[PDB]
Design a protein around this ligand. Structure first.
Ligand SMILES: COc1ccc2nc(COc3ccc(CC4SC(=O)NC4=O)cc3)n(C)c2c1
Lengths: 254, 259
C-alpha cells in the first residue's frame, strides 16, 4: 500500500511542477547563484519600473501593494489548476470545491511565498526582481506592517528545509481542509485529506530520515498559517479604510 | 484523439468555471420556462397589478430600469469571476484585462440574457419572476424600446440551440477579443482566443454533429451583439438628457465611458 502513497506523491509532484512555474528549487537557485534586479530604495524602485516589465502599472506604497495583489490573483489561478489535479477533488460537490479554494488560497499563497523569501527580501516578477525586506518596512503605515509577518513566518517555515515534492503534498493537504465554513459534504473531503496526510507522512519520512518529527512540526505550522491569514484580513479591511471601478471587481479579495 | 484532448480539457474546464460563476444556467432557465416542475414555476408580471402583486416575492418604468441596472452590476461581477478563470487572462497586462471586460461585459450580458428569454418574456429575480415582452414594450418612451432588440436577437439566437457547455467557450471567445480599442498587447490576447476558437469549433462539432456550419453562424451572431450594444448606448445618451434626476450605476458609468 505504501507504493500507492508513493504513486500519489509522484502524481502530486508532477502536477505541482506543471502548475507552478517558479518552483522553490528555481527561487533558491536565484537567491544563491546561477541575477535578479534588487529593489532596495525608492531610486532602485524607479529603475525597476523603468527596466523590469511589470503588468500592474496603470503614491508608491499603494502601487507596490496593488502589484502584490496582481500576483495574488495569478497565484489563485495556479492554485486552482493544481487543486483540480488532486485525486477526488473534481468529483466533490461543486460548491464544496469553490469553498475549499476560497478559504485555502491564502494559506497556500503564504506557504509558497515563503519559498520566494529569505531573511532579507522576496523575489518578484517571476524571479526577475528581488525586493528587500528593509524597503518593505520603510513603506509608510499601514503598508509597512504588511510583509513583516510574512517574513517572520517564512524564516521559521524555511528552517524546515522542505523541497517542492514535500510542499506539493502539504499544499494538497491544505486544500482538503474539512473544516471550511459552509461545506455540504465533509466526509469525502476528510477521506481525501487522510490519504494525503498518509502520503505526506511517508514522503517526509523517506525524504528527511534525519528529522524525527518533521511531520508533526509541519502540521504545527498550519496554525501559524491561519494566524497570518486571520491577522492579514484585518490589515485588509483597514486597507479598505485607507484607499478611497472595473479594476476593483477584479480585486475583490487578495 | 491527438491534441483534440487538450481542447476537450479546456472545454471541460471552461464549463466547470461557467457553472461555478453563473447561478442561473440556461438549463435551469429552460426547466423553469417550459413546464418540468411545479416548484420552479415563476410569477408572471404583465401589467400594473401583477407588478404590484409580484413586488412581494422579489415611478414604474424607472423602477424596472433600476432593476435592470442592478442585475447588470451583478452580471458584471459574475462575468469578472468567470473571466479570471480563462487560462492566461490574469497573466495579461492589467490595462488589457480592464479593456477586455469593459467591451465584452455587455455582449456577454445580452448573450446570456437570451438564455432567460422566449418570444413572450424574460425571467427575472433568479427565475422567481417572468416579465412579459409586451409589458416591457408598454413602458413610457423611450423605456418601452429598451428591450425589443434584445428580444429579437434572443429569438434569432436561441434557434441555434446552444447549451451551457457551448456558451461557456463562446463567451470566453467574446472576452478575449483582440480588436478592442486601446489594447496594449494584442498578440497574447489573440493567441488565447485562437486556443478558445479551436476549443469552440471542436465543442460545436461534437455537441451538435448535425448542425451544419454552426461555428460560422455563432461567430456571425457577434455582429448582432455589436449592433445591440451600440443602439443601447445611444438610448442611454437620450435618457441622460431626458432624466436629469436619475443616476446610472458607477460601474455601468465606467463601462459605458468612451465605448
Ligand atoms: C424590477 O423588475 C425587474 C428586475 C430585474 C430585471 N432584469 C431584467 C432583464 O435583465 C436585463 C435587461 C437589460 C440589461 C442591460 C442593461 S439595462 C441598463 O440600464 N443597463 C444595462 O446594462 C441587463 C439585464 N428585467 C426586465 C428586469 C425587471
Amino acid at each position: 500500500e505504501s507504493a500507492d502513497l508513493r504513486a500519489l506523491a509522484k502524481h502530486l509532484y508532477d502536477s505541482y511542477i506543471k502548475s507552478f512555474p517558479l518552483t522553490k528549487a528555481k527561487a533558491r537557485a536565484i537567491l544563491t547563484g546561477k541575477s535578479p534586479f534588487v529593489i532596495y530604495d525608492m531610486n532602485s524602485l524607479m529603475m525597476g519600473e523603468d527596466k523590469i516589465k511589470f503588468k500592474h502599472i496603470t503614491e508608491v506604497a499603494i502601487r507596490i501593494f496593488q502589484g502584490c495583489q496582481f500576483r495574488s490573483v495569478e497565484a489563485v489561478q495556479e492554485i486552482t489548476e493544481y487543486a483540480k489535479s488532486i485525486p477526488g477533488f473534481v468529483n466533490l460537490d461543486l460548491n464544496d470545491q469553490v469553498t475549499l479554494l476560497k478559504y485555502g488560497v491564502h494559506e497556500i499563497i503564504y506557504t509558497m511565498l515563503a519559498s520566494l523569501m529569505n531573511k532579507d527580501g522576496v523575489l518578484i516578477s517571476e524571479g526577475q526582481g528581488f525586493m528587500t525586506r528593509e524597503f518593505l518596512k520603510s513603506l509608510r503605515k499601514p503598508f509597512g506592517d504588511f510583509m513583516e509577518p510574512k517574513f517572520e513566518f517564512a524564516v521559521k517555515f524555511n528552517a524546515l528545509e522542505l523541497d517542492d515534492s514535500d510542499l506539493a503534498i502539504f499544499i494538497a493537504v491544505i486544500i482538503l481542509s474539512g473544516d471550511r465554513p459552509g461545506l455540504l459534504n465533509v466526509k469525502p473531503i476528510e477521506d481525501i485529506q487522510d490519504n494525503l496526510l498518509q502520503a505526506l507522512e511517508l514522503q517526509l519520512k523517506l525524504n528527511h530520515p534525519e528529522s524525527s518529527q518533521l511531520f508533526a512540526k509541519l502540521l504545527q505550522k498550519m496554525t501559524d498559517l491561519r494566524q497570518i491569514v486571520t491577522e492579514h484580513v484585518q490589515l485588509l479591511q483597514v486597507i479598505k479604510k485607507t484607499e478611497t471601478p472595473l479594476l476593483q471587481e477584479i480585486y475583490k479579495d487578495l
